[PDB]
């Protein structure tokens, strides 16, 4: 963990694209 | 833009370099202005002239008496080096060979070069004139 | 050693190639001109004593 | 068809999953050739033990006795050679100066001076008077410390001693 | 080790060459004839001692030759300074590396000699000697520091290490197990002898010489010498001050493309001047092309080099443009009369077949002139809304624009008068946008002409949208983003009649191409003749005579007579209508009439009347983005065979040479890209030739080298196309494996409209050009100066990352090289900040410095990568009246999971717009107006967004037609780069949401209290965070460094090197001048000693009052040394108490510990010490600090205390903590707790410290 951002190749198995994406409510 | 030594508001002197093996920072920006310099916003820019790179530094008796002694220790028509050869032939006489080598080295150390290929008669002419 | 991307043609059709036994590197080294494409700077080894 | 002083394991070659190349079936050369440097008795142990059967099948009936006599001569030469044992299975009268020097090297002791005497190997092998041995036996010292083993003969030869060791190793 | 030794042996065998013939070499024979040398016979050990002592004497003479009295050379050749150096003493100690190399060689030699001296004294046996020589040649690198001085020597170590391995195991079989000793030192001896063979003459040469734009300038000097030396003295004294004046003037006139001519000049000296100018011009041209080819490949360079090279190639392209315009004015029109009449009558027949009505001039009042003029002024002020500081020529432009706002009818009258009258125009300036790969022009127009051209642009697009001038296959449209264009193209490929059935030899052909030199080959007279059919003749003459104007670059003026001016407002119309004339030439009138359908009932994009007119022709899909065409053919067997026969009739191929030169997609694997079967290659050649025959080369030109053909047949499993930056591979379900259904990103599942079953799969990738453009943008971000703050660089990085991801949403996950490039460029951006902090590279650095949002004082960085938050960085602490409480709260969330895909957004958009249509139909019949109650369930859902329905500017933005191609052509008018060129927020809405990213960023970083431990907040004495504000987008570098000083200046960040500041106890790890300049300003005027003495005096005033309650007879303030406040090796007592009769003392316990059991060791003297602390993030626990300092200072022979019973009080100033540890007499512990509470709440010296911290951080509340 010496900084060192790692590549995302092969590090997504159960994570989708639409997950954890939320929308806003109409204001007033 | 570059900052001077007057816009620093509170430099002080360098009391002691170290205590207990820990190096003490001298509280002034003199050495930082010697190594590099400042801009108007307070960034630092360092000089980069280190060509050799120095990889260890990055991480820290009279001459007449000499001639009389040599003419005493020589036989006629004999070189000094030949006398060394004969008196070194443990040798037969360690002490006189030691004395001869010492007088030869005291003559070499005074600037007289090539005294080994020197006969007795030429040293006698040197002592005469 | 450090080194000193081909399209599908009519010539390298794998439907024409019978794959029976796998061809290895020592086959290319013992016989440098039968199984090699672009054999530039190879040297011919001794056969047998 | 489509700095680091060690060498890394990723630089290795011959990582090939072939039944022919992992077991490359090295030669033994008529049971006569030997691989150099690797121990000859160990090479005779790790052999296929097949050509020995070919020997004892194809030698003459007198040649089995010839092979046995040659092996007995070789074992006689080996027994003349070994007569270089370890000091734990040797006696005191046969223990040569090289064996005493290896015995001094085993317990990490070294001595300065001329003609250092032989140290003590055991209490049954020591040379103390028997009443001192009885007192030491009653005190409970089963095995001597090396400072005892060296300083007791030098202490009995009336010599001045400088012992370099720390407190708690049996200097007293 | 075997394989590497065999590698070295093969290299030495291959690199062997026979030695060169020479005279036989005898150094010692020439040494023997000299009388200064004698010969003798000596033992080896004696001469081995003589050589090493002579080498020691030589190095001693070389040390004390430069009068260096402070360097001591040990007898084992170890060189050490005797004291701490200064600046000049480090300058005078700069020897070459040959010195230290000879030092280490003589050290090795003395080890080798003394190993035998250890033997011949009777210490060791020869059995122990041969092992010792074996360890030396094997472990040179471990016993000597010679490896740091020569790097190629690393070859010599590992070889000697590899020979170390083999022999050992070849020694270690049988009864031999492990342990020291082989004794086979020769193998390590030969390698170092062969090393000394090469190192010897270099060191001899060093001792020998120790003990004893410019090329063009030299060429110009040689030319001037050749000129001036030939002339005699009376002409030498004249032409030295005669030639040099016009010598630069001729070069300047060449650079400005001015013909050089002067009267009264002889011809040979004129030819010499011409040769000088020609040679310097060739040098300058080669230098400019070489400097462009250096920076094209990504090599770093100074910014001034790029700024000069852009001007050099700008001048060269200006000279090329003035050449090609002169070539057009000399060669006449390149188009024949018959081709012009043919395309003219073709346009006539197409406009008669569609019954088009021409666009008239607005007579007096169209009743929409005001809306179009306001939209034109808003588009003109769209660029000037970026920055609030402008130049004077731009202030005049904004003044003219505001005068057009204030009096709109006079502005409309001026526009209409310039339309009806004006035909001459002011000169247009030219500049180039410095893209690293492709030069692109930006034009500068007079603002009074620009307002007229913008109103003309608005009026022409508003009339062209109403009159239905453009067929729907002309792309881009206002309603479709280009990924939606790709998706509708894939659905149009899927929904054809039996497009995948190839059982009888059918074929699919996908052509993509670009009209080469579309903008530069438009004749203006032909443009006027084709433009008079659709608009008024005065409007056509206005649009034609505008292009015939002079273009200027700062010294150079040239008129324009061939090619259109692309930087105009209305020029976006000129691109789109003339390409429709290309639609008449490639597609044909019959097929375009079938695609566009009747004028009374026009067809949709990629739709037809019936299936018979759809499949009755092979030309059955067509699309054109601005210059790139994309065509799709369906062939039967006999048509394809006849087309191949018609191709091979005029162009035979006897050797099948059309395979070599076929453009093919290399980003896909070989089973994925096009297989080059001979029938398919011949069919693609036939298709491209049949398309090329329909276009006259004087009008436009397509090229095979920039085109692509993908053929699907029985022998090709898949189809390919590049469009809108997307690489697309279509692959059938029936031609592949079974049902398996593994969900992957970047995969569009294609289904039929009628049967609604899955028929094919579309695979998406990002092309190479977009990745190279992104890497160009990364390199432009990396051209930031050192004075630029970090927040601007992070904002540019975030802008580039959003502009990449929000266009390439689904395709980034599919490609892996872009995922590697993003992480690599992210580490380069982080390293750019890490070097800007300190010049030395840190071992570790937290991501929480970068990814903290700007509201909490951070940079607000976006994340595309796998970054982990390690443990013991999410722990935080708090102090209250009962003591100190600690609390404990992982990966940083990324951007791609917080963005919707394309396909689900398209399905959601279709569903919400269908539901909006049904609710609108139910709302009209019930006499009901739609409100926010009926549309709160589909908020921010759909392309375009539903938010555009509730805007105030409905009647204004409803009149803006043709905005997408204008938004794309904004890049030719504004000098800044344009991210989000494919969208506009007022029309399509906002297509993403980034507040969840900040929410999960605050949540994932341990909370606000977990973040603020790194931020020096507890030194500022603010009880809450919510009542605070920053002094005002950007943060300075000094304030950023002073803010993040608790997490940068740590022991595990800059390992090993630590120093202490003079007047404080602040320990700096490494050195940071940008933090030292703040630490001097805050801690000035002996503030550390003032705080220490203030706490001492306040505690002495505490012990002065309440005297009889503790049985104190005398309080004493000790004579504190002025260096005691910051010395930390030892300490002394500060306040001493004398007991009246006797006191009981307890065991040493903490300040918060109340379990006190006192012993019988009654003492009279009691002592109190005050210790201050400046801590960091990993070491700020004041309780264990007080305990460790008490157990250190009371258990050493260096500190002096008069009493064995006392207490040590430790105060951390970086977090404002305080604790105590030691002995206690009765009544003292709650008194000292309340006293230290009152001190930490009401010390004026601590108040001065905290207000100086708040002044330095510029943080208020």
Cα separation, D95 vs D99, whole angstroms:
6
Q: Is residue E131 a contact partner of residue E183, using CB atoms and an 8 Å limit?
A: yes
Cα separation, E323 vs E327, whole angstroms:
6
DSSP classification of residue E696: -
CA distances from C31 to C1, C24, C25, C27, C28 (A): 20, 11, 10, 6, 5
Label each residue of chain D as H, E or C: CCCCCCCCHHHCCCCCCCHHHHCCCCCCCCCCCCCCCCCHHHHHHCCCCCHHHHHHHHCCCCHHHHHHHHHHHHHHHHHHHHCCCCHHHCCCCCCCHHHHHHHHHHCCCCCCCCCCCCCCCCCCCCCCCHHHHHHHHHHCCCCCCHHHHHHHHHHHCCCCCCCCCCCCCCCC
- Half-sphere exposure at residue E428, Cβ-oriented, CA atoms within 13 angstroms: 26
For CA atoms E1072, E1073, E1079, E1085, the dihedral sign is positive
Cα separation, E1072 vs E838, whole angstroms:
6
Q: Is residue E1187 a contact partner of residue E1153, using CB atoms and an 8 Å limit?
A: no
> How big is the CA angle at E431 (ends E421 and E458), to the nearest 5 degrees?
40
Q: Is residue B11 a contact partner of residue B33, using CB atoms and an 8 Å limit?
A: no
Closest residue of chain B to E1127, computed from CA coordinates? B19
Side by side, which strands form the sheet with E726-732? E719-723, E726-732, E758-766, E747-751
E171 touches chain D (CB under 8 A): yes
Q: If residue E812 lies in a helix (H) or strand (E), which one and from where to where?
A: helix E811-814
Q: Is D171 annotated as a binding residue?
A: yes
Nearest partner of E432 among E422, E449, E414, E444, judged by Cα: E444
How far D50 CA sits from the closest chain C CA (Å)?
27
How far D116 CA sits from the closest chain E CA (Å)?
14
Cα separation, E221 vs E219, whole angstroms:
5
Residue E898 has its nearest CB partner, among A4, A12, A21, at: A21
Write out chain E residues lying below 8 Å of D37, CB-based: 170-171
CB contact under 8 A, D39 and E175: yes
CB contact under 8 A, D5 and E158: yes
Residue entry with tokens 């010195």:
E99
Cα separation, E644 vs E663, whole angstroms:
19
Under DSSP, is residue B63 helix (H, G, I), strand (E, B) or coil? helix
Structure token pair of residue E105: 């060689």
Nearest partner of E977 among E824, E785, E781, E782, judged by Cα: E781
Pairing of strands E883-888, E619-624: unpaired
Write out chain E residues lying below 8 Å of B19, CB-based: 1127, 1129
Choose the mutation target among E15, E664, E668, E675 for the interface with C, i.e. most C CBs under 10 Å: E675
- In angstroms, the first-to-last Cα distance of chain B is 77
Structure token pair of residue E115: 């190993």
Structure token pair of residue E1227: 């009544």
- Residue E1174 main-chain phi, psi, to 5 deg: -120, 100
E-facing residues of A in 1-28 (CB < 8 A) are 1-9, 11-12, 15-26
Query: CB count, 10 Å around CB of E1089?
Result: 19
Residue D5 has its nearest CB partner, among E1, E4, E161, at: E161
Closest residue of chain D to E176, computed from CA coordinates? D39
CB contact under 8 A, A7 and E823: yes
Cα separation, E1117 vs E1134, whole angstroms:
6
Write out chain D residues lying below 8 Å of E139, CB-based: none
Nearest partner of E1064 among E1076, E1050, E1051, E1049, judged by Cα: E1076
Pairing of strands E1058-1061, B22-25: parallel
CB contact under 8 A, A7 and E900: no
Q: Is residue D102 a contact partner of residue D126, using CB atoms and an 8 Å limit?
A: no
Q: Helix crossing, E637-650 with E678-692: angle to 10°? A: 70
Q: Is D166 annotated as a binding residue?
A: yes
Q: Is residue E700 a contact partner of residue E521, using CB atoms and an 8 Å limit?
A: yes
How far C41 CA sits from the closest chain D CA (Å)?
23
CB contact under 8 A, D2 and E669: yes
How far C29 CA sits from the closest chain D CA (Å)?
16
The DSSP secondary structure of E1108-1166, one letter per residue, reads TTTTEEEEEE----TTTTT--S--B--EEEEEEEEE--B--EESS-----B-S--EEEE
Residue entry with tokens 């050693």:
C1
- Half-sphere exposure at residue E878, Cβ-oriented, CA atoms within 13 angstroms: 11
Query: CB count, 10 Å around CB of E71?
Result: 15
Regarding chains E and D, contact by 3 or more CB pairs under 8 A is answered as: yes
- Half-sphere exposure at residue B120, Cβ-oriented, CA atoms within 13 angstroms: 13
Q: Is residue B49 a contact partner of residue B34, using CB atoms and an 8 Å limit?
A: no
Torsion of CA B29, B31, B32, B36, to 10 degrees: 140
Residues 6+ apart with CB under 8 A from E1027: E1261
Cα separation, E625 vs E973, whole angstroms:
20
Q: Is D111 annotated as a binding residue?
A: no
Cα separation, D131 vs E1182, whole angstroms:
66
- In angstroms, the first-to-last Cα distance of chain E is 68
Nearest partner of E425 among E443, E458, E448, E404, judged by Cα: E448
Nearest partner of E104 among E203, E207, E241, E238, judged by Cα: E203
Closest residue of chain C to D16, computed from CA coordinates? C24
Write out chain E residues lying below 8 Å of C15, CB-based: none
Helices and strands per DSSP (H, E), number in chain E: 44, 26
In sequence order, what are the beta bridge partners of E622? E631
E676 touches chain C (CB under 8 A): yes
For CA atoms E255, E261, E265, E266, the dihedral sign is positive
Burial (CB count <10 Å: 0-12, 13-18, 19+), residue E945:
middle
Q: Is D88 annotated as a binding residue?
A: no
- Residue E480 main-chain phi, psi, to 5 deg: -125, 120
Q: Is residue C14 a contact partner of residue E675, using CB atoms and an 8 Å limit?
A: no
How far B117 CA sits from the closest chain E CA (Å)?
8
CA distances from E757 to D11, E740, E741 (A): 51, 15, 14
Pairing of strands E1217-1222, E1149-1150: antiparallel
Q: Is residue E940 a contact partner of residue E947, using CB atoms and an 8 Å limit?
A: yes
How far D16 CA sits from the closest chain C CA (Å)?
11
Closest residue of chain C to D14, computed from CA coordinates? C25
Under DSSP, is residue E224 helix (H, G, I), strand (E, B) or coil? helix
Q: What is the resolution of this structure in A?
A: 4.6
Query: CB count, 10 Å around CB of D27?
Result: 7
- In angstroms, the first-to-last Cα distance of chain D is 82
Under DSSP, is residue B69 helix (H, G, I), strand (E, B) or coil? helix
Cα separation, E93 vs E80, whole angstroms:
12
Cα separation, D133 vs D139, whole angstroms:
10
CB contact under 8 A, E670 and C7: yes
Structure token pair of residue E1190: 């008490």
- Residue E138 main-chain phi, psi, to 5 deg: -85, -35
Burial (CB count <10 Å: 0-12, 13-18, 19+), residue E895:
buried
Helix ranges (H only) for E407-531 are 408-420, 447-466, 482-494, 524-531
Q: Is D33 annotated as a binding residue?
A: no
Cis before E711? omega within 30 = no
E931 touches chain A (CB under 8 A): no
Cα separation, E878 vs E885, whole angstroms:
5
For CA atoms E640, E646, E647, E652, the dihedral sign is positive
Q: Is residue E1156 a contact partner of residue E1229, using CB atoms and an 8 Å limit?
A: yes
Nearest partner of E469 among E350, E388, E343, E320, judged by Cα: E350
Query: CB count, 10 Å around CB of B104?
Result: 21
Using only C-alpha atoms, what is the Rg of chain D? 28
Nearest partner of E640 among E606, E603, E685, E671, judged by Cα: E685
Structure token pair of residue E1251: 């207000």
Nearest partner of E950 among A26, D23, B47, D129, judged by Cα: A26
- Residue D131 main-chain phi, psi, to 5 deg: -75, -35
Nearest partner of E728 among E901, E490, E514, E511, judged by Cα: E490
Cα separation, E767 vs E897, whole angstroms:
22
- Residue E507 main-chain phi, psi, to 5 deg: -140, 150
Structure token pair of residue E380: 């003109």
- In angstroms, the first-to-last Cα distance of chain C is 29
Write out chain D residues lying below 8 Å of E157, CB-based: 5
Write out chain C residues lying below 8 Å of D1, CB-based: 12, 14, 17
Q: Is residue E401 a contact partner of residue E377, using CB atoms and an 8 Å limit?
A: yes
Residue E174 has its nearest CB partner, among D2, D12, D41, at: D41
Under DSSP, is residue E743 helix (H, G, I), strand (E, B) or coil? coil
Q: Is residue E990 a contact partner of residue E940, using CB atoms and an 8 Å limit?
A: yes
Regarding chains A and D, contact by 3 or more CB pairs under 8 A is answered as: no
Residue entry with tokens 């927020």:
E985
Closest residue of chain D to C6, computed from CA coordinates? D2
Cα separation, E1135 vs E1100, whole angstroms:
7
Residues 6+ apart with CB under 8 A from D15: none
- In angstroms, the first-to-last Cα distance of chain A is 45
Q: Is residue E860 a contact partner of residue E853, using CB atoms and an 8 Å limit?
A: yes
Structure token pair of residue E562: 């061939």
Residues 6+ apart with CB under 8 A from E359: E460, E463, E464, E467, E534, E535, E536, E539
CA E869 to chain centre: 23
Cα separation, E509 vs E618, whole angstroms:
10
SS3 helix, strand, coil % of chain E, rounded to 5?
Answer: 45, 10, 40
Q: Helix crossing, B80-87 with B94-108: angle to 10°? A: 150
Nearest partner of E635 among E578, E572, E712, E690, judged by Cα: E712
Residues 6+ apart with CB under 8 A from E658: E681, E682, E685
Q: Is residue E1076 a contact partner of residue B32, using CB atoms and an 8 Å limit?
A: yes
Q: Is residue E1088 a contact partner of residue B37, using CB atoms and an 8 Å limit?
A: no
Label each residue of E1171-1183 as H, E or C: EEECCCCCCCCHH
Cα separation, E879 vs E1019, whole angstroms:
13
Helix ranges (H only) for E364-474 are 369-383, 392-406, 408-420, 447-466
Burial (CB count <10 Å: 0-12, 13-18, 19+), residue E539:
buried
Cα separation, E970 vs E980, whole angstroms:
11
How far D1 CA sits from the closest chain C CA (Å)?
8
Helix ranges (H only) for E297-391 are 303-331, 337-354, 369-383
Buried b (16+ CB within 10 A) or exposed e, E581-604: bbbbbbbeeebbebbbbeeeeebe
The DSSP secondary structure of B73-117, one letter per residue, reads H--TT--HHHHHHHHT---S-HHHHHHHHHHHHHHHTTT----TT
In sequence order, what are the beta bridge partners of E761? E731, E749
Cis before E746? omega within 30 = no
Cα separation, D100 vs D94, whole angstroms:
11
For CA atoms D79, D85, D89, D94, the dihedral sign is positive
Structure token pair of residue E113: 């000699």
Residues 6+ apart with CB under 8 A from E1104: E1115
Structure token pair of residue E685: 């050649």
Residue B17 has its nearest CB partner, among E84, E148, E839, at: E84
How far E158 CA sits from the closest chain D CA (Å)?
7
């Amino acid at each position: 963990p010496t900084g060192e951002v790692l590549s995302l190749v092969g590090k997504l198995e159960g994570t989708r694209m639409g997950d954890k994406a939320q929308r806003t409510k109409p204001q007033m | 833009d570059i900052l001077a030594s007057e816009d620093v508001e509170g430099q002080e002197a360098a009391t002691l370099p170290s205590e207990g093996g820990v190096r003490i920072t001298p509280f002034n920006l003199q050495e930082e202005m010697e190594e590099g310099h400042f801009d108007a916003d307070g960034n630092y820019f360092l000089n980069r002239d280190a060509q050799i790179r120095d990889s260890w530094l990055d991480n820290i008796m009279s001459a007449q008496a000499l001639l009389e002694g040599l003419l005493e220790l020589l036989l006629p028509r004999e070189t000094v080096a030949g006398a060394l050869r004969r008196l070194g032939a443990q040798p037969s006489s360690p002490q006189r060979l030691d004395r001869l080598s010492g007088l030869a080295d005291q003559m070499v150390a005074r600037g007289n070069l090539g005294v080994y290929q020197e006969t007795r008669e030429r040293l006698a002419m040197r002592l005469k004139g | 050693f450090e080194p000193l991307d081909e399209d599908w043609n009519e010539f390298n059709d794998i439907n024409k190639i019978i794959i029976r036994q796998p061809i290895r590197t020592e086959y290319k080294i013992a016989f440098p001109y039968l199984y090699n494409n672009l054999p530039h700077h190879v040297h011919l080894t001794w056969y047998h004593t | 068809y489509l700095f680091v002083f060690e060498w890394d394991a990723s630089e290795d070659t011959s990582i090939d999953y072939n039944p022919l190349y992992k077991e490359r079936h090295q030669v033994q050369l008529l049971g006569r050739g030997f691989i150099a440097g690797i121990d000859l008795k160990q090479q005779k142990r790790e052999q296929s033990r097949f050509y020995g059967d070919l020997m004892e099948k194809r030698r003459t009936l007198e040649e089995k006795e010839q092979e046995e006599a040659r092996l007995r001569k070789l074992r006689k030469k080996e027994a003349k050679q070994r007569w270089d044992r370890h000091w734990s299975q040797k006696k005191l009268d046969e223990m040569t100066d090289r064996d005493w020097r290896i015995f001094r090297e085993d317990y990490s002791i070294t001595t300065k001076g001329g003609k250092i005497p032989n140290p003590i190997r055991s209490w049954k092998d020591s040379s103390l008077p028997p009443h001192i041995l009885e007192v030491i036996d009653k005190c409970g010292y089963k095995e001597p410390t090396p400072i005892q083993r060296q300083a007791i003969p030098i202490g009995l030869q009336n010599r001045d001693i400088i012992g370099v060791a720390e407190t708690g190793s049996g200097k007293t | 080790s075997y394989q590497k030794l065999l590698k070295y042996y093969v290299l030495n065998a291959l690199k062997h060459r026979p030695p060169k013939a020479q005279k036989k070499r005898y150094l010692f024979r020439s040494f023997k004839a000299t009388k200064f040398f004698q010969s003798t016979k000596l033992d080896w050990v004696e001469v081995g001692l003589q050589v090493c002592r002579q080498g020691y004497n030589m190095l001693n003479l070389l040390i004390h030759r430069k009068n260096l009295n402070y360097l001591h050379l040990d007898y084992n050749f170890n060189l050490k300074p005797v004291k701490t150096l200064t600046t000049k003493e480090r300058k005078k100690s700069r020897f070459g590396n040959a010195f230290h190399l000879c030092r280490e060689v003589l050290r090795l030699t003395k080890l080798v000699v003394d190993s035998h001296v250890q033997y011949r004294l009777g210490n060791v046996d020869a059995f122990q000697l041969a092992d010792g020589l074996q360890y030396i040649f094997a472990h040179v690198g471990q016993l000597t520091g010679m490896y740091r001085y020569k790097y190629k020597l690393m070859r010599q170590i590992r070889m000697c290490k590899d020979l170390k391995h083999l022999i050992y195991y070849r020694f270690n079989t049988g009864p031999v197990g492990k342990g020291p000793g082989c004794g086979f030192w020769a193998a390590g001896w030969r390698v170092w002898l062969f090393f000394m063979r090469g190192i010897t003459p270099l060191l001899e040469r060093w001792l020998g010489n120790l003990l004893a734009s410019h090329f063009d300038l030299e060429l110009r000097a040689a030319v001037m010498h050749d000129i001036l030396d030939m002339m005699p003295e009376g002409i030498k004294q004249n032409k030295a001050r005669t030639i040099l004046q016009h010598l630069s003037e001729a070069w300047r006139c060449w650079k400005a493309n001015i013909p050089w001519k002067v009267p009264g000049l002889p011809t040979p000296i004129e030819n010499m001047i011409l040769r000088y100018v020609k040679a310097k011009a060739d040098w300058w041209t080669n230098t400019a092309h070489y400097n462009r080819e250096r920076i094209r490949r990504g090599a770093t360079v100074d910014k001034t080099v790029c700024k000069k090279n852009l001007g050099r190639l700008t001048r060269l392209y200006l000279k090329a443009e003035q050449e090609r315009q002169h070539n057009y004015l000399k060669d006449g029109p390149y188009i024949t009369a018959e081709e012009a009449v043919a395309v003219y009558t073709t346009t006539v027949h197409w406009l008669e077949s569609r019954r088009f009505s021409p666009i008239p001039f607005p007579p007096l009042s169209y009743k929409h002139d005001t809306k179009l003029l306001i939209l034109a002024l808003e588009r003109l002020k769209e660029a000037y809304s970026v920055k609030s500081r402008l130049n004077q020529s731009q202030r005049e432009e904004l003044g003219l624009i505001e005068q057009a706002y204030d009096n709109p009818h006079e502005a409309l009258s001026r526009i209409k008068r310039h339309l009806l009258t004006q035909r001459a125009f002011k000169e247009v300036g030219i500049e180039f946008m410095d893209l690293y790969s492709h030069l692109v022009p930006v034009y500068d127009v007079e603002p009074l002409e620009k307002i007229t051209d913008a109103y003309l642009d608005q009026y022409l697009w508003y009339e062209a949208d109403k009159r239905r001038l453009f067929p729907p296959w002309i792309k881009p449209a206002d309603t479709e983003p280009p990924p939606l264009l790709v998706y509708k193209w894939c659905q149009g490929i899927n929904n054809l009649q039996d497009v995948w059935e190839t059982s009888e030899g059918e074929c699919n052909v996908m052509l993509e191409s670009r009209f080469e030199k579309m903008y530069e080959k438009i004749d203006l007279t032909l443009l006027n003749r084709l433009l008079r059919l659709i608009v008024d003749h005065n409007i056509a003459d206005y649009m034609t005579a505008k292009n015939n104007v002079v273009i200027n670059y700062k010294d150079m003026n040239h008129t324009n007579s061939y090619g259109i001016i692309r930087g105009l407002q209305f020029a976006s119309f000129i691109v789109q209508y003339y390409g429709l004339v290309m639609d008449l030439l490639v597609l044909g009138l019959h097929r375009a009439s079938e695609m566009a359908g009747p004028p009374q009932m026009p067809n949709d994009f990629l739709s037809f009347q019936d299936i018979a007119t759809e499949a009755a022709h092979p030309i059955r899909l067509f699309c054109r983005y601005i210059d790139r065409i994309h065509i799709f053919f369906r062939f039967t067997a006999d048509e394809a065979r006849d087309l191949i026969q018609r191709y091979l009739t005029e162009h035979p191929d006897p050797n099948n040479e059309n395979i070599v030169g076929y453009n093919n997609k290399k980003c896909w694997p070989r089973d994925a890209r096009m297989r080059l079967m001979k029938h398919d290659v011949n069919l693609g050649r036939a298709v491209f030739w049949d398309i090329k025959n329909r276009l006259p080369r004087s009008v436009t030109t397509v090229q095979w080298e920039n085109s692509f053909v993908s053929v699907y047949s029985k022998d090709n499993p898949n189809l390919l196309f590049n469009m809108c930056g997307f690489e697309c591979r279509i692959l059938p379900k029936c031609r592949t494996s079974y049902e398996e259904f593994t969900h992957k990103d970047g995969v569009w599942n294609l289904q039929n409209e009628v049967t609604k079953e899955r028929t094919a799969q579309c695979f998406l990738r990002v092309d190479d050009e977009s990745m190279q453009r992104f890497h160009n943008r990364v390199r432009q971000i990396l051209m930031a100066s050192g004075s630029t703050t970090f927040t601007k660089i992070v904002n540019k990085w975030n802008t580039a990352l959003i502009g990449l991801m929000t266009y390439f949403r689904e395709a980034v996950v599919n490609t892996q090289e872009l995922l590697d490039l993003l992480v690599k460029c992210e580490n380069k951006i982080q390293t750019r900040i890490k070097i800007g902090l300190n010049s030395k590279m840190p071992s570790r650095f937290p991501p929480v410095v970068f990814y903290t949002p700007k509201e909490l004082g951070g940079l607000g960085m976006l994340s595309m990568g796998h970054v982990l938050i390690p443990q013991s960085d999410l722990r935080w602490s708090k102090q209250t009246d009962v003591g100190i409480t600690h609390f404990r709260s992982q990966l940083i969330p990324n951007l791609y999971r917080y963005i919707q895909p394309w396909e689900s957004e398209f399905i959601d958009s279709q569903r919400v717009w269908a539901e909006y249509a049904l609710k609108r139909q139910e709302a009209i019949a019930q006499n009901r107006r739609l409100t926010l109650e009926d549309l709160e369930d589909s908020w921010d859902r759909g392309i375009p967004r539903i938010n555009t329905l509730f805007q105030k500017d409905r009647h204004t933005l409803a009149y803006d037609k043709g905005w997408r191609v204008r938004t794309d052509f904004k890049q030719y008018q504004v000098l800044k780069q344009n991210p989000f060129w494919w969208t506009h927020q007022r029309h399509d809405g906002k297509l993403w949401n980034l507040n969840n990213y900040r929410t999960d960023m605050i949540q994932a970083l341990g909370g606000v209290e977990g973040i603020l431990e790194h931020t020096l907040f507890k030194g500022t004495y603010f009880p809450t965070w919510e009542g605070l504000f920053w002094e005002k987008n950007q943060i300075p570098n000094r304030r950023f460094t002073l803010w993040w000083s608790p997490t940068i200046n740590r022991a595990n960040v800059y390992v090993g090197f630590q120093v202490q500041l003079d007047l404080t106890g602040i320990f700096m790890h490494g050195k940071i001048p940008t933090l030292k300049i703040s630490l001097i300003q805050i801690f000035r005027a002996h503030l550390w000693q003032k705080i220490h003495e203030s706490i001492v005096m306040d505690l002495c005033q505490v012990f002065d009052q309440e005297l009889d309650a503790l049985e104190i007879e005398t309080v004493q303030k000790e004579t504190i040394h002025p260096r005691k406040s910051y010395k930390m090796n030892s300490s002394c007592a500060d306040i001493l108490l004398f007991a009246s009769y006797k006191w009981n003392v307890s065991r040493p316990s903490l300040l918060a510990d109340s379990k006190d059991v006192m012993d019988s060791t009654t003492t009279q003297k009691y002592w109190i010490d005050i210790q201050l602390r400046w801590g960091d993030y990993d070491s700020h626990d004041i309780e264990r600090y007080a305990r460790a300092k008490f157990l250190d200072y009371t258990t050493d022979n260096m500190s002096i205390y008069p009493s064995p019973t006392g207490v040590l009080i430790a105060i951390d100033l970086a977090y404002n903590l305080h604790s105590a540890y030691g002995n206690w007499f009765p009544g003292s512990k709650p008194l000292i707790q309340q006293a230290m509470a009152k001190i930490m709440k009401a010390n004026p010296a601590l108040y001065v410290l905290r207000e100086r911290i708040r002044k330095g951080l510029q943080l208020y509340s």
